[PDB]
UniProtKB/Swiss-Prot annotation, chain B:
Residues of the full protein shown: 511 to 663 of 973
Domain of life: Eukaryota
Assembly description: Homotetramer. Heterotetramer with TRPC1 and/or TRPC4. Each subunit in the homomeric ion channel (via ANK repeats) interacts with one copy of GTP-bound GNAI3; the interaction is direct and activates the ion channel. Interacts with TRPC4AP. Interacts with NHERF1. Interacts with MX1 and RNF24. Interacts (via C-terminus) with CABP1. Interacts with SESTD1 (via the spectrin 1 repeat). Interacts with PLSCR1. Interacts with PKD2L2.
Name of the molecule in the record: Short transient receptor potential channel 5
Species for this entry: Homo sapiens
Tissue: Expressed in brain with higher levels in fetal brain. Found in cerebellum and occipital pole.
Protein family: Belongs to the transient receptor (TC 1.A.4) family. STrpC subfamily. TRPC5 sub-subfamily.
Subcellular location: Cell membrane
Ranges in the topological domain labelled Extracellular: 26-93
Function, in words: Forms a receptor-activated non-selective calcium permeant cation channel. Mediates calcium-dependent phosphatidylserine externalization and apoptosis in neurons via its association with PLSCR1. Acts on distinct neuronal populations in the hypothalamus to regulate innate behaviors including feeding, anxiety (flight/fight/fear), socialization, and maternal care.
Record's disease association: Loss-of-function variants in TRPC5 may be involved in a mental disorder characterized by maladaptive behavior, anxiety, autism, postpartum depression, extreme food-seeking and hoarding behavior, hyperphagia and obesity.
TM spans (from-to): 3-25, 94-114
Curated annotation (Swiss-Prot), chain E:
Family: Belongs to the transient receptor (TC 1.A.4) family. STrpC subfamily. TRPC5 sub-subfamily.
Subcellular location: Cell membrane
Protein name according to UniProt: Short transient receptor potential channel 5
Record's subunit section: Homotetramer. Heterotetramer with TRPC1 and/or TRPC4. Each subunit in the homomeric ion channel (via ANK repeats) interacts with one copy of GTP-bound GNAI3; the interaction is direct and activates the ion channel. Interacts with TRPC4AP. Interacts with NHERF1. Interacts with MX1 and RNF24. Interacts (via C-terminus) with CABP1. Interacts with SESTD1 (via the spectrin 1 repeat). Interacts with PLSCR1. Interacts with PKD2L2.
Annotated positions binding Zn(2+): H19, C23, C25, C28
Residue window of the full protein shown: 154 to 204 of 973
Signal sequence residues: none
Originating gene: TRPC5
Length: 664, 153, 664, 40, 51
């Protein structure tokens, strides 16, 4: 038998106090008034007594939305501490008004009335409290190192984090941004960015800051949604303190704001500047138009070079035409790259016709990269993540040019390639040019963003490359482990190349041999074993060491089971899970990426593709009027868009019953 | 670590099927076992350049069927010097049945098992990692074991 | 401009009729009574007038749960047709009572009050209507061919199917089975089975019959759940009209009823007859006990053979001990099968020691199979789906024995195997024995049901084999297509075996050749190409027919892309989808299969494993009392377990308001 | 005729098939309370 | 809402006809160039009403 008692005892109520609290709960005004008037004279009932749940008479009256009993208790001067917080959390406007006109707590000490109202996101109570001059303390820098911040963190790191989270919950309230904010959209953008940075910094409190940032982004998107005309939309997007605010939204990674259907419609209308009816056209018509504009890109470039002010000179400045011209230029460059591989004994030969036509494109690519670096800046250049591949391409092309020049000025004779040096400059130049061709042909992935059916796919692939990068670390660890083991076991039986059947040593011979004789060769053997191109007889030695052969073959089999069976299916499961997490947001991400791609063609700089590139207070008032209209519409829409309801209904019915019984 | 349990569950059935087919192929092929001297390079087994005697013994049959999962077992091992075409076809069809059961059925089945088991850990992955990392942190809170090897001796 | 009018016009109401209907809707009793009394004299208002929604005054009064206005309208003799159906569908007991005491329709003509009450599954109204002698028409046979059924189907196949579905919805009601049913559990079982058969037969109306059968199964499971003691449970399971009703539930595939935790507890208590505390034991203790009982299975079998009445004679009759003994016997059989492969030039040799010890096991297996066929019957034998593998094993073993006998009595000399005939009886016997060994070793899959961690897995694999069978048809179609094509292209260049390097022809040689020379060899080449064991040089001919070689290689590549890339990943997706559909029900399916496995060991027949096998009205009254208790408990539990509620609240408030205003 | 029957049946079936409800209930209760207090 | 829709259809009320999906009249292009947000919103509202 387990005895049950009250381990943490409290002060029980008397019979009269319990009767008074029950009368307050039932809403009987007459009995409560009589009890108060009698407590004034006899002092037999404590009006500030709690209940077994901790609520007092005032808290019970607030929870039941009984304004009459609330006012009756307030007129008798009951304890009122923290009652405003309970009235605000209950989201009852009349109670808040009555408390503005005049121990254990469910609210933390740092909670203030305005902060709690912002937490509740109730426009009425927030506006009530903002009518009075109320103020939220300013949060310090995300990485602030002042004496006050470190002192508060060392004294109490739980109180400090809780206070910061409460302040950022108050500031991130959509109703508190609709009011008391000069620019709600820019405030929402900055607040979302700062909350994302705090989520990055605060690891434990990450989900809350993430959801607050997402709430701010959704607030900005809904504010943009309330626009009802193109004039208002272009006033919003072009406000600067064109498309300045849209560029700011792109800077703060506001994907929901950018992917707005109206914003995307405006961007598409700007994108097809020359063609007014591109939206309603057949597939064959669009294909023929694109092919015709692409085949005429040198004519358009030359017309822009000669006279920019003409029917053909400024025709390339249109964003879609500019994109088509750049794509056609890159396609011709890749076609010449394909032609390049179509005497070969010359040591350091002069460049051929195809290479002489390739050189202008390489120079134009390098000049365009350095011009983008000089104009846009450094951070914008490194934020692209495609300028890395462009830098690799340009560096490899420059190395190819340098090695070609060196081999031309250091060699004159025509010696057959069979007796050339392994590190001959021509060979290194050819290898670097082949790698550069691979990279240049792979550079066409960035054009999948301009397509409707190839954009979300590319976004999904970019997002799934992160799971592959995560799996690559563990795969490489296992690979290094097994390579070290097999090398340690097999390096004793290394044989010279002359002893091999065809003077060939390694796994790239017809008969593979010395697969695990060195660390590098062991790494390559275990890499090629993933694809099955490593034969099983490589785990063999000429000596009759059957135990060593079996141990090596079993190491090989263990590596096969770990990589091909465990790691590969594990990576498949990882990618399968990661893809479903992008299925929903694929369209918004693609629209943001395509918006960036479109905005990249809106500038006057870089108009000519290679190789032709080497040859005012009314605004603020209009924006404020539009913002006022948007705020009104958004407040109305959000207003238009449990047991407490039934409890309020029961309280009303009981109060009406008691007053009818008293009247009759 | 949580997906290794599904692999351990699949390993039992895979090993049962492997033992079954190994016993069958051994029972069928152990009559045609040839000495190592008769082999082209005095090498007997599946680790030679020309694989031979792949199903001549239970151990060698197990290893041949293990390596057949990764495709490193050539098809001409299901051959005999005699003109027993029926026996050769029956052995090759046992081999093909084992291939279909393991590579096609069992492997995709294991993939589906791991795919289902991963989604069941997606939600609780953070809490499990935080518990494991808490244990790792508490392991370094003690005075014992302060000096790493070889300074501890 | 699109003009909008009333294409299907109706008869509009007058002002007085609309006012009367509005007074009925608002619940004002006085105005409605005055309107009725005035319509009696002046005949100015039609009391049977509809509304723009088709409802009359009586229907409006029923929908608002206004019993006073309902009775007032009934006393004035308003039209009452089909009002009982609306009162039943509304699930208002008082309205049904008032209508029992006394045009367009929302109910089909075949709907009757008792049928609609059964559809609503309302115990109160169903009992009300069953108090009166009410009757549901009997549905005919699922495959009935009488004149009435075919006549009704040919005259109106929509009315007939609807009537059948309504009748089966009425009969499958849990409340209508709680009442008016001698045995609710057996009725639920039979009804679920018949609804499943109808779902199989009625393809268009499949989901409805499936959900009705599932509802009946859940009703039976919940009736079993209401048991509160082991006595009641064993009374239910052992009722026969032991474990007779449990065997009936197993026969009707009642997986939810079988997998009941209490039923499974009783079955486990019966399963561990000898061990009372097997539930609370360590892993090592259970393992040692199982190993000890398995190593002593011949002693237990011999003790049962000599004296069944002893501490060891009847110790094997315990179900768990019997299962352990049979498993140990099969394990020893497989161990001897493994020993079997451990002079060989004898044509038709006599059996060795291992085969002489194997023969008793084979004879015992055959005798056990034929004894199961003779005892259980034919349908039960073919329902197992494992007796197919047992039949294959026994047929192959019998063929092995026959071929061994023939080779022994037809050959005496010792000729080396190299010069033996291709179809020598010894070779066929050895091949059949190897196939039999494969099948016998694969027979251990059926023992995974007895394990907790291996049972649901085996169920999932059995359920995923159906998707593989579905994919096999399309794979074989594509395989046959490409095999026919490659054969048609390549059969001209077939070369003799002597012309081959080692007198070897086919793909099983060291150098593969003639891979697509015949239909059979083409099928095998394309089969082995799935696993990559078919080399690429087989798509080559000695002649310089480069076009033919390229066309054949491209057929091969197309087949590779279709099978390995498309079909294989498609099958992976199929199995991945099919597995999640079994994840939820895996435990119940495993528990049903394990219950069947346990019940298989409850019989006296087949006690000895191979090779030792070849050497009363109180019951119904108790069951009825238990069933009455269960029905009461289930009705109470189901009773314990939208805009119409708010509409009823508003109607009550408005009626009270009007009556208060009239009184004052 | 068949289409008219179908339209009637569909309208009836669709008719047969939040805070504003509670607000309407509270409004009705408050109005009844005020009118009772005024009458008494 | 069937009741209110029928109420308003009792009076002769009329919804403007949407033009062709690929219409190229002067009115459509003028409305699209003047305000492409108001035009799309009006078309969507008309097609929500008709559907
Ligand atoms: C993004 C990351 C950067 C990518 C771009 C890097 C651009 C850098 C370009 C610098 C190229 C310099 C070539 C070496 C010339 C000097 C020389 O003699 O070679 C010596 C060594 O030879 C080598 O080590 C060859 C190195 C080739 C690097 C290939 C990078 C592939 C990137 C793939 C990316 C996927 C020969 O020795 P010896 O003296 O003759 O004796
Ligand atoms: C479940 C489905 C049934 C499965 C069990 C079947 C049992 C049936 C058993 C009957 C076995 C009869 C053997 C033939 C003897 C006659 C003979 O001379 O062979 C002749 C032909 O030879 C053949 O066709 C061999 C056929 C082997 C069948 C193997 C079945 C494998 C089932 C795998 C299942 C997975 C030789 O020709 P000749 O006259 O010498 O010239
Ligand atoms: C001896 C060795 C010889 C080797 C010769 C062959 C070498 C082959 C190398 C192959 C490398 C291929 C890399 C291709 C990556 C494609 C990624 C596609 C998806 C994608 O769009 O990724 C974008 C980044 O681009 C990128 O990921 C660009 C990657 C550049 C890699 C440079 C090094 C290679 C992400 O988009 P985003 O980051 O812009 O979006 C910002 C939103 N906020
Ligand atoms: C002739 C043969 C020659 C063969 C030569 C090569 C042999 C290679 C053998 C490879 C075996 C690799 C085993 C690695 C297992 C890695 C598991 C990673 C996931 C993981 O963290 O598992 C933890 C256990 O660690 C572990 O699973 C440790 C496993 C130790 C295995 C020892 C035998 C090998 C679970 O974490 P936790 O259990 O601590 O969490 C308790 C929470 N309540
Ligand atoms: C020249 C050719 C030489 C070939 C030599 C090698 C031949 C190898 C043949 C391999 C065939 C393997 C078949 C194994 C099937 C395993 C199925 C495991 C899952 C499972 O429990 O299936 C149960 C049926 O058993 C079954 O599926 C038994 C299948 C019997 C197949 C017989 C033919 C082979 C279903 O359980 P259940 O149906 O009892 O559940 C009734 C609930 N209502
Ligand atoms: C991921 C990070 C670590 C993962 C940890 C563990 C993964 C599981 C461990 C894998 C052990 C593989 C053993 C390989 C082996 O013993 O045989 C090679 C050698 C090759 O000669 O073969 C044998 O020694 C006997 C082969 C019998 C069958 C082995 C069955 C092991 C697993 C089979 C299939 C899985 C597909
Ligand atoms: C898991 C536990 C048991 C699973 C049970 C059953 C799995 C399915 C049974 C598999 C039968 C495979 C048959 C292989 C065979 O007959 O040919 C080998 C032999 C090799 O010589 O080829 C043939 O005899 C003719 C080949 C024709 C095509 C066979 C198609 C069978 C399945 C094909 C593809 C599946 C991918
Ligand atoms: C399933 C039922 C039908 C499915 C229907 C269609 C499936 C897709 C059609 C597959 C066409 C495969 C073409 C193979 C081929 O042309 O080359 C073979 C031959 C082999 O000599 O190679 C070529 O002719 C040129 C190869 C260039 C690359 C071909 C790319 C095709 C698909 C590639 C990868 C897919 C992984
Ligand atoms: C696929 C194999 C045969 C290699 C072919 C290389 C190129 C000829 C392909 C590869 C990627 C293709 C590009 C993928 C994406 C687009 C976007 C597309 O733009 C649109 O979708 C129209 C809508 C718009 O951009 O306004 C223009 C064609 C283009 C450049 C494609 C042109 C043809 C490209 C360059
Ligand atoms: C896995 C490789 C090495 C082949 C081994 C073959 C056998 C030695 C294995 C294969 C399947 C195993 C069986 C799988 C299932 C079970 C159920 C198990 O029963 C239980 O789970 C205890 C609970 C109960 O049955 O009451 C008894 C062991 C047994 C027969 C196992 C015994 C060992 C078996 C026969
Ligand atoms: Ca760039
Ligand atoms: Ca059987
Ligand atoms: Zn600070
Ligand atoms: Zn009939
Ligand atoms: Zn128009």
């Amino acid at each position: 038998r387990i005895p049950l008692q009250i381990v943490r005892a409290e002060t029980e109520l008397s019979a009269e106090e319990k009767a008074f609290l029950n009368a307050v709960e039932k809403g009987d005004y007459a009995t409560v008034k009589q009890a108060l008037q009698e407590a004034e004279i006899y002092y037999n009932v404590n009006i500030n007594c709690m209940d077994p749940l901790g609520r007092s008479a005032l808290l019970i009256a607030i929870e039941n939305e009984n304004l009459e009993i609330m006012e009756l208790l307030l007129n008798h001067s009951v304890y009122v501490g923290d009652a405003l917080l309970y009235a605000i959390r209950k989201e009852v406007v009349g109670a808040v008004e009555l408390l503005l006109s005049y121990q254990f707590s469910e609210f933390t000490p740092d909670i203030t009335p305005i902060m709690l109202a912002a937490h509740t996101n109730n426009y009425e109570i927030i506006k009530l409290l903002v009518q009075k001059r109320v103020t939220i303390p300013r949060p310090h820098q995300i990485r602030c190192n002042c004496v006050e911040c470190v002192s508060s963190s060392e004294v109490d790191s739980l109180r400090h984090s809780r206070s910061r989270l409460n302040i950022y919950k108050a500031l991130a309230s959509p109703s508190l941004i609709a009011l008391s904010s000069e620019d709600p959209i820019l405030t929402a953008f900055r607040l979302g960015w700062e909350l994302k940075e705090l989520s990055k910094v605060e690891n434990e409190f990450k989900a809350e800051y993430e959801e607050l940032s997402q709430q701010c982004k959704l607030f900005a998107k809904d504010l943009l949604d309330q626009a009802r005309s193109s004039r208002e939309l272009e006033i919003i997007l072009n406000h600067r303190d064109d498309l300045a605010k849209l560029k700011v939204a792109i800077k703060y990674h506001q994907k929901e704001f950018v992917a707005q259907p109206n914003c995307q419609q405006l961007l598409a209308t700007l994108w097809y500047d020359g063609f007014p009816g591109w939206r309603r056209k057949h597939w064959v018509v669009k294909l023929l138009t694109c092919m015709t504009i692409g085949f005429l890109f040198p004519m358009l470039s030359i017309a822009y070079l000669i006279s920019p002010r003409s029917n053909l000179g400024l025709f390339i400045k249109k964003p879609f035409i500019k994109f088509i011209c750049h794509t056609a230029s890159y396609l011709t460059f890749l076609f010449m790259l394909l032609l390049a591989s179509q005497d070969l004994h010359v040591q350091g030969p002069p460049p051929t016709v195809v290479e002489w036509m390739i050189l202008p494109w390489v120079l134009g690519f390098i000049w365009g990269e350095i011009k983008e670096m000089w104009d846009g800046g450094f951070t914008e250049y490194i934020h692209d993540w495609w300028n890395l591949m462009d830098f690799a391409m340009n560096s490899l092309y420059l190395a190819t040019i340098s090695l070609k020049i060196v081999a031309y000025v250091k060699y004159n004779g025509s010696r057959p390639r069979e007796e050339w040096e392994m590190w001959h400059p021509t060979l290194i130049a050819e290898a670097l040019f082949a790698i550069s061709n691979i990279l240049s042909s792979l550079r066409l992935i960035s054009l999948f963003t301009a397509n409707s059916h190839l954009g979300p796919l590319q976004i999904s692939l970019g997002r799934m490359l992160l799971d592959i990068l995560k799996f690559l670390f563990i795969y490489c660890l296992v690979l290094l482990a097994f390579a070290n083991g097999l090398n340690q076991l097999y390096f004793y039986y290394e044989t010279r190349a002359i002893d091999e059947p065809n003077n060939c040593k390694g796994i790239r011979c017809e008969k593979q041999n010395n697969a695990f004789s060195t660390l590098f060769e062991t790494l390559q053997s275990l890499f090629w074993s993933v694809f099955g191109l490593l034969n099983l007889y490589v785990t063999n030695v000429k000596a009759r060491h059957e135990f060593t052969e079996f141990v090596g073959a079993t190491m090989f089999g263990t590596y096969n089971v770990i990589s091909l069976v465990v790691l590969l299916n594990m990576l498949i499961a990882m990618m399968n899970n990661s893809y479903q997490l992008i299925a929903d947001h694929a369209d918004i991400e693609w629209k943001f990426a395509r918006t960036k791609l479109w905005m990249s063609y809106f500038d006057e700089g870089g108009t000519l593709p290679p190789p032709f590139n080497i040859i005012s207070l009314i605004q603020n008032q209009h924006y404020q009027e539009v913002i006022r209209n948007l705020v009104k519409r958004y407040v109305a829409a959000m207003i238009r868009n449990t047991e407490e309801n039934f409890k309020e209904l029961k309280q009303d019915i009981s109060s009406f019953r008691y007053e009818v019984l008293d009247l009759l």
